[PDB]
């Protein structure tokens, strides 16, 4: 909920314990922590996801006012080899991170760099805050 649309499947690149980039100027530089929403439950398996997936995270590098604080938000770049259902495999330069509330609304107001097509179609406020899609 909060997202507009179905649970669609794109390959997994970002297990738990993965530091990925934030490039907006909300203040953060990095995102780490545990959790992935809509993750299964299997013995010995890591929670790892994308598809504009929402995840729990902390600022490892950034301002202290928002360090030490767990927060939800959404994957926008992955750098794994994803497949578009229209032809080719896609992949980015890097992973990218960035911050929001549980309804999908952003703490920041603009995004740097490209954002995934399916991530923007699934999350409206990301599409409004993004100037660059793909």
């Amino acid at each position: 909920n909060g997202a507009q649309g179905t649970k669609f499947r794109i390959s997994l690149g970002l297990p738990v314990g993965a530091i990925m980039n934030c490039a907006d100027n909300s203040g953060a530089r990095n995102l780490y922590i545990i959790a992935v929403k809509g993750s299964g439950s299997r013995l010995n398996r890591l929670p790892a996801a994308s598809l504009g997936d929402m995840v729990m995270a902390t600022v490892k590098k950034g301002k202290p006012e928002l360090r030490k604080k767990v927060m939800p938000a959404i994957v926008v770049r992955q750098a794994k080899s994803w497949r578009r259902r229209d032809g080719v495999f896609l992949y980015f330069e890097d992973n990218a991170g960035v911050i929001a509330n549980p309804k999908g609304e952003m703490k920041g107001s603009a995004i740097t760099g490209p954002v995934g097509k399916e991530c923007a179609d699934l999350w409206p406020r990301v599409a409004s805050n993004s100037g660059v899609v793909v």
């Binding site: 080899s81 032809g87 080719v88 495999f89 896609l90 992949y91 980015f92 330069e93 890097d94 760099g113 490209p114 660059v132 793909v134």
Partner: protein, 148 residues
């Protein structure tokens, strides 16, 4: 459906083939295969590699500029879909390909003329070089024709 060109090989990239890379400038680099992808990763110069088309067109192999090669312009301003216009274009493309192929064959002829003169001069130097094998050739031909 589209047919893209490989960033490295300038080859067609059909649907369901190759890999695309999306730079931070929001720029797409699609490759026909992992060979070209890995060359891009290793930061090779495709204008130095002889198996691309860029090297060829820059070196003066199969020609670069011609009237045939201007028709495949990308078009960002569309048109009303006249099926008569579509049917005309379908014949036009086939005709243009014949014309371009003929001009290409002509360019290759222009490049490869002057080779038979060189080959003949090679053979002349060789035969005038090495007569002591020609004696073995003469005697063996004579032996064979006397044998038969």
């Amino acid at each position: 459906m589209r047919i893209y060109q490989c960033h490295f090989c300038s080859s067609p990239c059909y649907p369901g083939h190759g890999i695309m890379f999306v730079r931070n400038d929001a720029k797409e680099f699609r490759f026909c295969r992992s060979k070209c992808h890995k060359a891009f990763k290793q930061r090779r110069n495709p204008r130095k590699l002889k198996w691309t088309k860029a090297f060829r067109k820059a070196a003066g192999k199969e020609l670069a500029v011609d009237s045939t090669l201007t028709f495949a312009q990308r078009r960002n301003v569309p048109v009303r879909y006249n099926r008569e216009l579509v049917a005309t274009t379908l014949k036009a493309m086939a005709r243009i390909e014949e014309i371009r192929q003929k001009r290409e064959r002509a360019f290759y002829k222009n490049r490869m003329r002057g080779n038979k003169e060189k080959d003949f001069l090679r053979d002349k130097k060789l035969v005038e070089s090495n007569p002591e094998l020609l004696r073995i050739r003469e005697v063996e031909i004579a032996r064979k024709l006397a044998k038969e």
